[PDB]
Amino acid sequence: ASLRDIKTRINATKKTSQITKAMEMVSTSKLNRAEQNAKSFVPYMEKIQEVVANVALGAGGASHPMLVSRPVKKTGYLVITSDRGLAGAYNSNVLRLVYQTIQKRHASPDEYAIIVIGRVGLSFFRKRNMPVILDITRLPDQPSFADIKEIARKTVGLFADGTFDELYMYYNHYVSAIQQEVTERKLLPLTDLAENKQRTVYEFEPSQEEILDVLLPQYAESLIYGALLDAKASEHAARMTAMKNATDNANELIRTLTLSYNRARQAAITQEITEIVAGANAL
Amino acid sequence: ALAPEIVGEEHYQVARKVQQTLQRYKELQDIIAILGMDELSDEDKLVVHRARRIQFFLSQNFHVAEQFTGQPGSYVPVKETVRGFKEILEGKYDHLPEDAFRLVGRIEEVVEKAKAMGV
Amino acid sequence: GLTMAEYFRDEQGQDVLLFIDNIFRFTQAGSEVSALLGRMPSAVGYQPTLATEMGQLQERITSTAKGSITSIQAIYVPADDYTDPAPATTFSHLDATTNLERKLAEMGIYPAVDPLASTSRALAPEIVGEEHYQVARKVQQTLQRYKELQDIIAILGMDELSDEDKLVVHRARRIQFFLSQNFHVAEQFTGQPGSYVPVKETVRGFKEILEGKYDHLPEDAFRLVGRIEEVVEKAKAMGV
Amino acid sequence: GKHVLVVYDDLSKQAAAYRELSLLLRRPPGREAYPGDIFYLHSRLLERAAKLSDAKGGGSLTALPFVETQAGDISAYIPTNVISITDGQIFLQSDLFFSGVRPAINAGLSVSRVGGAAQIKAMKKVAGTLRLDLAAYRELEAFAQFGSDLDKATQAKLARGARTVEVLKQDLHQPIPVEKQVLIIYALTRGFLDDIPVEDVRRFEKEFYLFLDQNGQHLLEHIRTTKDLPNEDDLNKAIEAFKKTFVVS
Amino acid sequence: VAGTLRLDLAAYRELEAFAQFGSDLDKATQAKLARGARTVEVLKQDLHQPIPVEKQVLIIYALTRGFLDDIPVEDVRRFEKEFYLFLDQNGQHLLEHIRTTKDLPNEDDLNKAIEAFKKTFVVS
């Protein structure tokens, strides 16, 4: 093509590559803090699990964890998605997984409903008209417990009110800086655990019902927050990896364009010299 | 000679739609190369999905080429060409593997080739 | 025409204007005639004597002790690239360049003058005034920051980054639209009468818009209106 | 035995004039119609500048040839020839000039082969750190559009680069003595200047020169006499004494 | 109407490039997308179809005033053709006034006919 076209194309690719590099740097920076936030939150959930594995009292009267298995009514699905794109297969994986699984598991909208976190999830469930009832958007890039508690209290109360009697949630899991996996994990109506009897002291009066309603909603809240932190870490890792790949592709394209530009240069110089000499040879 | 009053209204419409989809694919391929397929819009994803199949289906196995490869040639009438391309554009074969559209004659050959394959 | 101007500046010492429209045609005609004259060709097919041919004309337009000629003369840039020898050689002779730019003209932003490429050695603090110099450099700076946002918002979006983005973007585009003035000549294309704004009013209105006296005013009020009072009047009319 | 400084305001115009003259004399044309000995023309010119040995008169002649490029086309015939001939180059960038870098000297594309022995020890002791800092800041300048990087050390690079740029800026027709350049570069490199606002650094350097004229005669005389940095502790004492009085605005 | 149409199309041109990646585009600025698409569909015609200036300007007025922004982008061409037929059916006075005075007729009189065609028009 023309030298001007090739040069402009090279410059545009260069600027896009630099912007993608900056985006990778900022994504890695945000990961550098999401990881430490998750690690700092881990001991709180450790404590809540330690407390939970005494309140069970074997076959207790708690309505939530005793595997009620009442006739299933409007199974609840919770999805954790990003507010912004440019993350590769992060959102597509979780949305395709939820869609493929719910299509096989259930048949009619009276048998399921959706809880949505993130802009892409709600936009998808709107354009494909699905029964979503509760959602939230534009969560801050490093969330705390207070931000999500407002929605999660209502989500747990929804099961408390004899609705959403079967509940599942989907979120990408931070397996590694390179690999992120989309897990499906059961929630409070299907509660199961392993630890045997122990002893501890935190409102440790043996009053079963009182400690029960003190703990179990807060346990669900803590588990939701931990899963959310995991999902955010996964989002940051996916974004940084995708931007690295974008920079690599841009570099390869720039290399090929430079080859084409050099060949065009030598062709143009040859043409100009030939024309000058031919014009001079006349007179 | 590609005019509506010469080749037929349906022929003209099908040809124009095919060219439009191919032009859109050629426009999008730069973004596809630079930052991958992930960030395409849903409509653009379907446009690429049909554009690759159309581009493969434009191929054909000739009678002359029967010496390079064992596959015999094929003769495709205009009516069958138009019907096949209209069926592809209307979404009847969106589930087929895209390699089943390569070097085949009429449209039924695509279905039988795909059934012979892992489908 | 230059001889007629020279008579006035020499015989009577007046201050004379000399408007030459598309001086590029002069060198183009020289290039056309050189080949037929029998001279050997030059780099891009121009004449060998391009530089001296331009210089003999240009160096006669100079101020003397008795009089002074000033000349406003347009340049045609072939293919919209400033690397061609004909527009390249004329740069050395100019004291002030007003670079009209496409992709500014494409939005209909007349007179399409680029606040970035426009340069003049007359812009010095001790000649134009300290406040004028400060305002000019400040508006150049705030317009500089905006262009860099364009790429990052092309790949992300306007609202993606918020680091003082509202303030900086507002400051940038309100001045950028304010630079476009309705011309008296522009009646032939729009009917709307033009306006004349002096330098004191210009710098004062720019001080106001820079400090934020009119931060809430609409963008289209800045476009093609002239003085700041005219801006606020038309904004009140359109914006109730 | 004297020393001469020669500046050619434009080599490209000499090249154009010689090309026109050769073409009018009907000599065979060449690449861009330039005559066959255009390189020899400029080699004859720029090779006459030299530093004479001791056995001859110990004089010298130094040259600063100028080249004018169109739209930054540093791949053209005459610019490439002159770059090949000359012992160095400095590249002034109009974009940097417009963005506020007044000397506009791009430290990336500017090289000097003689650089080194062509300096005094005081400046050699501090030049490498500044060069390294500016080179590191070059890449980081592409990240400043993002509001914050979550580690201070990387943002420290941005801050130090901005302070470097503000230090290196200068006005017309006011050259600075090399000792007063050495002192301010030392102040920048040792972190004394790192706590000062960017808009205030430019005023700070002039106030520092005034404070030097007040109470640094011994330091300036020592630098002038020995071409070497003064006592590091005494210099730090003087700089902190000035910072005790300069006020942030 | 030429100036407003030109400015609207010119403004619509740029944001299409940014529309391929961002989802946070304002709903009010999505009206710009809709109007730009309507204009682009309006500015097409087939081979060998000369259109008189009066019917040429009536549809431009309807488009620039937003009288068809409620019709989907798919049906704009049928809107155009059936609108010309409706104008030939009823708009004789409008066409004659435009052809005679070279000026736009009273906005009320034409807007009534435009609204009548709007309520008559079926959408596929």
Chain D contact partners (≥3 CB pairs within 8 A): A, C
Structure tokens at E70: 């409620």
Structure tokens at E27: 């709903």
Q: How far apart are CA A212 and CA B22, in angstroms?
A: 63
Residue of C nearest to D71 (CA): C83
Structure tokens at A133: 């009832």
Q: Do the Cβ atoms of B99 and B116 come closer than 8 Å? A: no
Q: How far apart are CA A271 and CA D12, in angstroms?
A: 23
Q: How far apart are CA E32 and CA E45, in angstroms?
A: 23
The C-alpha torsion from D44 through D45 and D47 to D49, rounded to 10°, is 150
Domain B9-116, classified CATH 1.10.760.10, yes or no: no
Phi, psi of C28 (to 5 degrees): -65, -40
Cα distances (angstroms) measured from residue D102 to each of C144, C147, D170: 15, 20, 7
List residues bridging with D91 in a β-sheet: D106
Q: Do the Cβ atoms of A76 and A164 come closer than 8 Å? A: yes
Phi, psi of A133 (to 5 degrees): -120, -25
Neighbouring C-alpha atoms within 13 Å toward the C-beta of D111 = 6
Q: What topology does CATH give the domain A25-240? A: Pyruvate Kinase; Chain: A, domain 1 (3.40.1380)
C-E contacts at Cβ under 8 angstroms: 20
Residue whose tokens read 């093509």: A1
List residues bridging with C113 in a β-sheet: C100
Q: How far is E17 from chain B (nearest CA, A)?
A: 11
Q: Which listed residue (D27, D48, D113, D131) is catalytic?
A: D113
Do the chains E and C touch each other, judged by at least 3 C-beta pairs below 8 angstroms? yes
- Using a CB-CB cut-off of 8 Å, the residues of chain C touching E7 are 108
Structure tokens at E68: 């068809």
Q: How far apart are CA A122 and CA E23, in angstroms?
A: 12
Alpha-helical segments (H) within chain C: 2-11, 24-37, 50-58, 85-89, 125-128, 130-155, 165-178, 187-190, 199-211, 219-222, 228-239
Q: Do the Cβ atoms of A62 and A211 come closer than 8 Å? A: no
Do the chains E and D touch each other, judged by at least 3 C-beta pairs below 8 angstroms? no
Vertex D145: Cα angle to D143 and D149 (nearest 5): 55
Neighbouring C-alpha atoms within 13 Å toward the C-beta of C30 = 18
Residue of B nearest to E20 (CA): B41
Do the chains B and D touch each other, judged by at least 3 C-beta pairs below 8 angstroms? no
Q: How far apart are CA E123 and CA C42, in angstroms?
A: 66
* Of A106, E8, A273, C161, the residue nearest D77 (C-alpha): A273
Domain boundaries, chain B: 9-116
Helix (H) or strand (E) holding A46: helix A3-55
Helix (H) or strand (E) holding C20: strand C15-20
Q: Which of residues 238-277 of A touch C (CB under 8 A)?
A: 272, 275-276
Residue of E nearest to B43 (CA): E20
Angle between helices A3-55 and B9-35 in degrees, nearest 10: 70
Residue of D nearest to C150 (CA): D145
- Using a CB-CB cut-off of 8 Å, the residues of chain D touching C49 are 20, 24
A-D contacts at Cβ under 8 angstroms: 30
Q: How far apart are CA A45 and CA A27, in angstroms?
A: 27
Residue of E nearest to B28 (CA): E20
Three-state secondary-structure class, residue D101: coil
Q: Cβ C153–E18 below 8 Å, yes or no?
A: yes
The beta-strand segments (E) located in chain A are 75-80, 112-117, 132-136, 167-173, 181-186
The pairing of beta strand A112-117 with beta strand A132-136: parallel
Resolution of the PDB structure in angstroms? 3.6
CB atoms within 10 A of CB D49: 16
Under the phi-then-psi rule, with left for phi > 0, alpha for psi from -120 to 50, and beta for the rest, what region is C13? left
Structure tokens at B19: 């060219």
Q: Cβ C157–E18 below 8 Å, yes or no?
A: yes
Q: Do the Cβ atoms of C21 and C73 come closer than 8 Å? A: yes
Q: How far is A139 from chain C (nearest CA, A)?
A: 14
* Of B39, B38, B77, the residue nearest B60 (C-alpha): B77
Three-state secondary-structure class, residue A132: strand
The pairing of beta strand C119-120 with beta strand C96-97: antiparallel
Nearest-by-Cβ selection for A16 from C38, C45, C155: C155
Q: How far apart are CA B98 and CA B114, in angstroms?
A: 9
- C-alpha gyration radius of chain E: 16
Cβ partners under 8 Å of residue C91, min gap 6: C97
* Of C14, C180, C193, C208, the residue nearest C109 (C-alpha): C180
Three-state secondary-structure class, residue C16: strand
Q: How far apart are CA A188 and CA A67, in angstroms?
A: 9
Under the phi-then-psi rule, with left for phi > 0, alpha for psi from -120 to 50, and beta for the rest, what region is B3? beta
Phi, psi of C213 (to 5 degrees): -60, -30
Residue whose tokens read 């015989």: C11
C214 is in an annotated binding site: no
Cβ partners under 8 Å of residue D164, min gap 6: D130, D133, D134, D137, D188
Q: Do the Cβ atoms of B33 and B7 come closer than 8 Å? A: no
Three-state secondary-structure class, residue A244: helix
Q: Do the Cβ atoms of B84 and B116 come closer than 8 Å? A: no
Helix (H) or strand (E) holding C119: strand C119-120
Q: Do the Cβ atoms of C87 and C54 come closer than 8 Å? A: no
Cα distances (angstroms) measured from residue A44 to each of A77, A218, D58, D214, E52: 26, 11, 81, 63, 78
The contacts found for A175-182 with CB under 8 angstroms, 24 or more apart, are A176/A237, A177/A31, A177/A237, A177/A241, A178/A237, A178/A241, A180/A90, A180/A234, A180/A237, A180/A238, A182/A93, A182/A94, A182/A97
* Of D50, D183, D170, the residue nearest D114 (C-alpha): D50
Chain B contact partners (≥3 CB pairs within 8 A): A, E
Q: Do the Cβ atoms of C40 and C31 come closer than 8 Å? A: no
Cβ partners under 8 Å of residue C94, min gap 6: none
Q: How far apart are CA A45 and CA C138, in angstroms?
A: 54
Cβ partners under 8 Å of residue D38, min gap 6: D15, D18, D19, D30, D77, D78, D81
Q: How far apart are CA D208 and CA D245, in angstroms?
A: 10
**Positive or negative, the Cα torsion across D91, D93, D94, D97?**
negative
Q: Which of residues 26-55 of E touch B (CB under 8 A)?
A: 47
Q: How far apart are CA D83 and CA C57, in angstroms?
A: 33
- C-alpha gyration radius of chain D: 23
Q: Is E18 on the interface with A (CB under 8 A)?
A: no
Q: How far apart are CA C172 and CA C175, in angstroms?
A: 6
Q: Cβ C154–E18 below 8 Å, yes or no?
A: yes
Under the phi-then-psi rule, with left for phi > 0, alpha for psi from -120 to 50, and beta for the rest, what region is A106? beta
* Of E45, E60, E100, E62, the residue nearest E92 (C-alpha): E100
Give the strands of the sheet with A112-117, arranged side by side.
A132-136, A112-117, A75-80, A167-173, A181-186
Q: How far apart are CA C155 and CA D204, in angstroms?
A: 40
* Of E111, E108, E37, the residue nearest E72 (C-alpha): E37
**Positive or negative, the Cα torsion across C180, C183, C186, C192?**
positive
Chain A contact partners (≥3 CB pairs within 8 A): B, C, D, E
Question: How far apart, in Å, do the first and last CA atoms of chain D sit?
Answer: 52
Residue type, D234: D
Cβ partners under 8 Å of residue A249, min gap 6: B33, B34, B35, B36
Q: How far apart are CA B49 and CA B51, in angstroms?
A: 6
Cβ partners under 8 Å of residue D156, min gap 6: none
Cα distances (angstroms) measured from residue E75 to each of E38, E58, E72: 10, 18, 6
Cβ partners under 8 Å of residue A219, min gap 6: A48, A49, A52, A188
Residue of A nearest to D30 (CA): A273
Helix (H) or strand (E) holding D65: strand D60-65
Q: Cβ C151–A19 below 8 Å, yes or no?
A: yes
- Using a CB-CB cut-off of 8 Å, the residues of chain C touching D11 are none
Q: Do the Cβ atoms of C54 and C27 come closer than 8 Å? A: yes
Structure tokens at A143: 């969330």
- Using a CB-CB cut-off of 8 Å, the residues of chain A touching E19 are none
Q: How far is D70 from chain C (nearest CA, A)?
A: 6
Q: Cβ C41–A84 below 8 Å, yes or no?
A: no
Q: How far apart are CA D2 and CA D15, in angstroms?
A: 30
Q: Is C124 on the interface with E (CB under 8 A)?
A: no
Structure tokens at D182: 């050495």
Q: How far is C131 from chain D (nearest CA, A)?
A: 18
Cα–chain-centroid distance for residue A104?
Answer: 23
Q: How far apart are CA A97 and CA A183, in angstroms?
A: 9
Residue whose tokens read 């049906």: E75
* Of C85, C78, C147, the residue nearest C114 (C-alpha): C147
Nearest-by-Cβ selection for C40 from A4, A275, A280: A280
Residues constituting chain D? 249
User: Burial, B107: exposed, middle or buried (Cβ in 10 Å; 0-12, 13-18, 19+)?
Assistant: buried
Structure tokens at C51: 């530089």
- Using a CB-CB cut-off of 8 Å, the residues of chain C touching E3 are 190
Q: How far apart are CA C73 and CA C21, in angstroms?
A: 6
Vertex A248: Cα angle to A243 and A249 (nearest 5): 95
Q: How far is E66 from chain B (nearest CA, A)?
A: 27
Q: Cβ A22–D33 below 8 Å, yes or no?
A: no
Structure tokens at C239: 């914006």
Three-state secondary-structure class, residue D248: coil
Residues constituting chain C? 240
Q: What is the 3-state secondary structure of chain E? A: CHHHHHHHHHHHHHHHHHCCCCCCCCHHHHHHHHHHHHHHHHCCCCCCCCCCHHHHHHHHHHHHCCCCCCCCHHHHHHHHHHHHHHHHHHCHHHHHHHHHHCCCCCHHHHHHHHHHHHHHCCCC
Residues constituting chain E? 124
**Positive or negative, the Cα torsion across C205, C207, C209, C215?**
negative
Under the phi-then-psi rule, with left for phi > 0, alpha for psi from -120 to 50, and beta for the rest, what region is A246? alpha
Three-state secondary-structure class, residue D66: coil
Q: How far apart are CA D136 and CA D157, in angstroms?
A: 7
Mutate to test the interface with E, among B7, B29, B32, B41 (most CBs of E within 10 A): B41
DSSP letter for each residue of A144-173: -HHHHHHHHHHHHHHHHTT---SEEEEEEE
Q: How far apart are CA D246 and CA D205, in angstroms?
A: 11
Mutate to test the interface with C, among E18, E26, E30 (most CBs of C within 10 A): E18
Q: How far apart are CA C176 and CA C140, in angstroms?
A: 10
Q: How far apart are CA B49 and CA B94, in angstroms?
A: 8
The pairing of beta strand C15-20 with beta strand D3-8: unpaired
Cβ partners under 8 Å of residue A45, min gap 6: A222, A223, A225, A226
CB atoms within 10 A of CB A177: 14
Cα distances (angstroms) measured from residue C107 to each of C112, E3, E26: 9, 12, 21
Three-state secondary-structure class, residue D58: coil
Q: How far is E47 from chain C (nearest CA, A)?
A: 29
- Using a CB-CB cut-off of 8 Å, the residues of chain E touching C160 are 24
Q: How far apart are CA D155 and CA D161, in angstroms?
A: 10
Q: Is C157 on the interface with E (CB under 8 A)?
A: yes
Structure tokens at A36: 């430490």
Q: What topology does CATH give the domain C128-239? A: 1.10.1140
Experimental method: cryo-EM
Q: Do the Cβ atoms of E40 and E75 come closer than 8 Å? A: no
Cα distances (angstroms) measured from residue C28 to each of A134, C24, C32, C50, D70: 72, 6, 6, 10, 20
Three-state secondary-structure class, residue D86: coil
* Of A38, A50, A2, the residue nearest A174 (C-alpha): A38
Q: Is D70 on the interface with C (CB under 8 A)?
A: yes
Q: How far apart are CA D200 and CA D246, in angstroms?
A: 10
Q: Do the Cβ atoms of A227 and A43 come closer than 8 Å? A: no
* D113 belongs to the catalytic site: yes
Structure tokens at A70: 């009442």
